[PDB]
Design a protein around this ligand. Structure first.
Ligand SMILES: [Mg+2]
Ligand SMILES: [Mg+2]
Ligand SMILES: [Mg+2]
Ligand SMILES: [Mg+2]
Ligand SMILES: [Mg+2]
Ligand SMILES: [Mg+2]
Ligand SMILES: [Mg+2]
Ligand SMILES: [Mg+2]
Lengths: 506, 506, 506, 506
């Protein structure tokens, strides 16, 4: 009946030898969206202006549905879980994802002369279905504010599910209306067409996703030797140097290499005002295009250059109940700009671009774009505790070495969206519904496959170490006001939240 | 006891239908290294000057241990073995590697008023362990002087095992000390930490390595038709020419191609004095960088251009007992500079760079870097009898089409180093050891998987043929002084030692 | 469903021969704490001023969770239960602790123009977990106001769980901020990370703790002979007196003793105003320190000296519903200062300090600190009905004869905290929750192992006896206003509530 | 026969879940001692002068025998082994000790006009016996130079076994002869009276010791809360403050404590010249006495005060072959004075001495000696990588809480000495022996029982982390000269080599 709990809270992380199982429980608010209406959404302005909102053209639909987005490490791992993971394991990948929705409460809001009264709707339902068929558009973009909070007691407002569809603008960037955008390929999806479980309070819901065995790993390995220095220092080579002459002793950089470092793309960083996407390094795709930053993983000496480094905001502090952040922009003052530095890429990755000329005898010049040629080896950018766990990629005919420089394990199969909405309860009058929302507990269980790191080096290795400065800074703890304070800067991510800690000998 | 041999000499090559088994026996000297001390080694100078020694910065360790390096074809194949291999087989790969160490003799050297006396230390031991776990740094660089000699009676001095580790120079290229180089990732490896067999005379040792079935093949196939000429000459095509017009009869080069040749990188060759790595076509990686030569396999008409051709020294003659060559540079006058020409790449490989412009209607210009695009097909550089058999690559997150332009079958798993050192026998006094070294016989057995070549062409095919000029030049024979004389020039490698002899019909 | 009770009220005490089982049922209020937020708490002022609040520096966290603290005798025993226990048994210890939580009611509070309305939230949950792993900080301090009331009908407000963590102050006692205090060892604990049962009304919860068999006993034995007088009075000894001379008849104090009394520490009592911890007998530990009172158990003739006597407040009266006492100081006028006198220690314990000199022939002087030397025997301070049952001690490397002079059976394993919180029910708006709290019945069952006292003395023994003065004083009964009135003074504890009643013959 | 090795080199460390097995192999030199003579040894001077040699009086015997001393962590663990141990495990203890002696070589030294010639004595024997019965005096003193070197390739010269016996000096400290010292209790032990294995080359020897299950653990736990702060910060206590008054809110230091910190002894540090033992804090025992430093474990703010901190020399660098160090004093310039700081004792240990007075109302004064009183809890000093593994204590009637402030797990049963000597081979002439010594390989295998650390704190914990400064300093690596360079200072031991890293929650 209505008096028995349908599930239990678990945020724990359970470590086994080669596996860990993470539990993420959140108290979840499912708000009714747009009076249970699908709405066509769009933006007519295509000027692609940086620093100014609504400059890309799109056509899409916001659904009345909400969905659950747990894809980040900070959701499923406590900071010491992350410390244990990155310090002790050379790689890891998610295996099974189990999501439970339980302890449903549909709450009727009623407005009275005094405040809003909250009453249980005992027979109220919510509708839940997991879309694992790819029946509906997947929202692929990482680290969007749709995510659960890192802290267990963060109230999670399920984001409203909305998607963009194929548009075509015959007009310019300044077109006033976006109703010229829809194309015959533009697809409206009614999620109400899908079969969905209806749940009263006392009903529970669960779904399982299993990652394929082909799922790639998040690699924690760092190379302890330059790929250029793999020769024996005490011996000459029969190979010649770069220009074909004698390879000198102890001058190894001049020796011809059996391999190349990874590809390299020169990217620019502009500080100027009123710059468009076309002022950045970019490529035009479909309606708009994309910038090329951060680009190919490459060692950078500097801690701040944002065009070559994966750069993202992390919230300084996290309020427990932030409310619904739909259509809300992250306040700049509440976050910090952090850049994941490539210092861990020093041994395996190009420090500069490939330098060559077509002119015979000409001085080698930097090559804007060096695509993958046979014999390239490179390491990926380090993951962070704030990165997505996986990155689903769009279905295309052809992929090459799929990786997101933004983060996540590139996957061709990922947990589908779990769509939730409060069943509309109409008042019997036109254009009206009984005001109500759902609260429930969602536990996300992730099976993790771990590979413990193995190093026979004599000397000690670096570890992620929580320090007194970290505690005085208030990292990974709550403040006096109840806010879980991340308090992260780029140097803090190097020292705490980066992967590629595990020294690799080969 | 001490009076029975622990093994037998075998240098033979045994041919089966799809397999050959090579035996390489060498009389092996294991010298004590640095009084059984691990030493930190390094070079402070980073100016990367070509033509001048000690211009790359490195930090590493020389171990007291010695290791066995057999990775070259000339070690395991006689010249006629190579002739039989390259003439009769379209491809080959190593399968199992078996190494025997037997007939150990620990020899005590004692200095007397008259000369040095040599006595057996009958209870002296050597320590041997194969590192197949990748526990210790692998020395990946091909054709380093650590190799066994091509001739069976060459005395093989086991090279001292030394490696370079991650360094970081905050200073410039001119820094005086290399003790600023070590980093927290820099790993000292004590090989004495590994379990190792101790062997007296009368003990034998063996290890087996099996290449994975995923091991790539050394390909002996040459294309007998240009990839551009694969159309039927007698018929028109419905396809258009390059600019979209009628495809004319018997003008096939102008027809649009179903495929592209391989990637192309323009490289420069500089003859100037006092040139650094940065004057060559190159890329910066970690502490130093690498030159880009020879680059992508591409047909070259000329016999000598060293920047596009795999170029290496081959010794003119090989002394049977050369002594320990540790820290010795190959004498320029004792070797010859040979360049493996790409004439066998004529049909499958780009003869020039890709020629295109961004400017509409502009004249096509050479493209410095053409990375792999979908639809590229190409052939690898031909292997030589003097190439490594395999090339292990560094462990990285990501590889693309691993190949060494220097040679060898690119492998992700290769025989690990077999480490050998004389057990230190101390005198009972500080800083002193009984002077002693080990002689033993090492047999390296390699199983080879062969694919016999199949050609139905009516006319005869080219063969590697030993000629009277080869005999008068003294190739593949000893001279009057007992030196096995290779006497090779670039033309000699084309005619004798190159692969890609097997005509491929498709 | 919601219409069936999940448990029954039991406060009874059931006596068996060697065992009693106590039941403590309380009507329990679980209040939501700090809007379900973990808050960092601390005090910056370290002046350690007596008589003034907030003079110790600490850093810690208050959790949204509540916990159950039943550790006191007056909770589990009625006064006659205590009378029966102390009169009839030489010792007792707790064996099993069983806690039931049942008849849950989540009550929504709503504010209206007229008063606050209280409605059942029928699907509301609370979260409960017992932490028996020591996963979370145990609150070790005895007789803190977190306790249940002595009387069955006392409404028990579960205390908010909060803990202090390692701090380090580089500043002085006057530092303005406590955010300098956290250290790398300072640990924030999220109790929401633990798996916890969610319970609706109609769910019940229970946990069991079993004390180890190694659990010490609360000893009710008093010695009926001085440890100094254990000789036969009618006979001389061959032993000498204290200075080595003849041991005289009937002068036994001068005879050398086979044993010593317990250790002795001189403590001071200061009445002066504006005294700090450093004016008291004390020791500095970590951030602050501790006073040394009451110190080692020692006979005191006087009824009031608080530095040598276990001293604590007992409430004069106990209101049935006192409300939530979080952050509330006991009102001085509502309690009485009672001192447990050591009169029962007269025979076994030092009446003064050890008196000796280093100077040969010098007059013996009192020794400030006499630590345990071989041959010391002593009795513990008597327990009271108002003492804790057990005292858990902090985990340390080394313990010596663990005992709390404050009370309780020293234990290395005790019932863990049972953490309870109302599941936050959000309003769907930022920073807000439906105002609600839980009422439930908690029964604490304790198995007690008893040892009946055995005395063969001819004459009667003293007993705890309720007297007409006790009834006229209103002890152990309610007053006319419904308050359960303890009405205890030091003399009242000697006569009624002390242990060590059981005469021990040996 | 003589041509087969009797064992294999293993220095490896093998980690299992709850166990690790360490292998320590050393090349071991057994030198003939004193021409196979037992000699009476002694020192007549008893002035106990600090800073001057031979100031203690002793009588004893040096035996012709050598023994094996492996008792230190740095012998059996590589630095990363130590890092893995201290970072991942809350405690550890040794379980079984297995010692192998194999690959024996008896070497005859012969003097010739040119140098010394070294020849195998093939039929030469050494004598080995393990004394596990306690038949012979155990050398109990920790960290004496008799130890094996930390690095695997350190040549280990077995120390000559010598012991001191009961002496009594009726004279003064200035007596000229020590032949007055022997007493009827003074015991000469002939180790040649024991049965011992004789081994030729081709014989191997092994012994096993199993630690009792009662063996204590090396504790890696640090407390994350002060033992003074274990109360709930949000609640008042019924307990009174130190002087018996109201316990104020947030002033916890003034509350009476359920426990005391550990014992405290005030120690002095004198810098003056020509000071004797009697100028230091000390106690006279038997012939001489002992100083009291470092004393009871107590938190010290300062990094350098040597009287309260465990203080010892660590060698800056370690030569591989140092020769025989018998009767050799550590060169001051070759070591560093390091002090293990008590910062990890901050929460559990007294920061100052107990402060009290006998005078009523008198100001509390520091108490020179506070011995253990009931209710004391404390933590031990942290172990270091350079500490002994165990400390055997002398057999006595009575022990109290045996611990060495110098280090090691206090044990009543430890591996006995393995005594080795070269069998004297006489020349057939009076007072002469064929000059010979033995080299052999000794492997010491230790089974370790591990307890993995378990912490549920939300935030990260501190870790031992090898840093770039550590690598630039050359720690845990060899230098360019082949010396294994420890390069340790007090701050380096805090950060790298100390135990008590594992945060303990309770
Ligand atoms: Mg050239
Ligand atoms: Mg050279
Ligand atoms: Mg055209
Ligand atoms: Mg045509
Ligand atoms: Mg006398
Ligand atoms: Mg008498
Ligand atoms: Mg007082
Ligand atoms: Mg108070």
């Amino acid at each position: 009946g209505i008096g028995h709990s349908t599930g239990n809270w678990n945020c724990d992380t359970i470590w086994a030898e080669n596996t860990c199982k993470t539990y993420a429980s959140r108290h979840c608010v499912c708000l009714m969206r747009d009076m249970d209406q699908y709405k066509a959404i769009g933006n007519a302005n295509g000027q692609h202006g940086l620093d100014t909102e609504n400059q890309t053209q799109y056509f899409g639909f916001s659904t009345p549905w909400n969905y659950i987005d747990f894809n980040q490490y900070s959701v499923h791992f406590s900071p010491r879980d992350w410390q244990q993971l990155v310090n002790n394991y050379s790689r890891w990948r998610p295996r099974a994802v189990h999501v439970k929705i339980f302890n449903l409460q549909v709450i009727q809001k009623t407005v009275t002369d005094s405040g809003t009264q909250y009453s249980n709707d005992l027979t109220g339902t919510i509708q839940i279905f997991a879309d694992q068929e790819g029946r509906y558009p997947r929202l692929l973009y990482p680290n969007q504010t749709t995510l659960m909070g890192p802290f267990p007691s963060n109230i999670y407002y399920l984001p409203q599910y909305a998607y963009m569809t194929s548009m075509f603008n015959s007009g310019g960037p300044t077109v006033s209306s976006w109703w010229g955008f829809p194309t015959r390929e533009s697809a409206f999806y009614c999620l109400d067409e899908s079969p969905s479980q209806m749940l009263r309070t006392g009903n529970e819901w669960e779904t399982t996703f299993v990652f394929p065995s082909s799922t790639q790993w998040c690699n924690n390995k760092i190379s302890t030797v330059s790929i250029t220095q793999r020769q024996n220092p005490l011996y000459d080579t029969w190979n010649v140097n770069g220009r074909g002459d004698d390879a000198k002793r102890g001058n190894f950089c001049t020796w011809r290499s059996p391999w190349y470092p990874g590809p390299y793309i020169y990217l620019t960083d502009t500080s100027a005002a009123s710059q468009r996407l076309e002022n950045l390094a970019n490529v035009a795709v479909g309606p708009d295009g994309m910038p090329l930053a951060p680009g190919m993983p490459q060692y950078r000496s500097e801690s701040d250059k944002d065009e070559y480094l994966h750069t993202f905001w992390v919230p300084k502090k996290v309020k427990m109940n932030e409310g619904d952040i739909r259509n809300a922009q992250i306040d700049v003052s509440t976050a910090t700009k952090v850049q994941v530095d490539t210092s861990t890429l020093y041994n395996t990755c190009p420090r500069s671009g490939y330098m060559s000329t077509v002119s015979q005898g000409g001085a080698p010049a930097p090559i804007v774009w060096s695509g993958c040629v046979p014999g390239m080896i490179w390491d990926n950018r380090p993951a962070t505790y704030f990165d997505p766990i996986w990155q689903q990629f769009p279905e295309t005919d052809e992929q090459f070495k799929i990786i997101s420089q933004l983060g996540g394990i590139p996957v061709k199969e990922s947990p589908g969206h779990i769509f939730v909405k409060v069943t509309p309860k109409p008042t019997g009058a036109a254009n009206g519904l009984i005001d109500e929302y759902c609260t429930f507990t969602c536990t996300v269980e992730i099976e993790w496959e771990l590979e413990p790191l193995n190093t026979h080096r004599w000397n000690m290795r670096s570890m992620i170490s929580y320090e007194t400065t970290d505690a005085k800074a208030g990292r990974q703890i709550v403040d006096e006001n109840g806010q879980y304070q991340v308090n992260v800067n780029s140097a803090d991510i190097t020292r705490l939240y980066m992967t590629k800690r595990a020294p690799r000998t080969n």
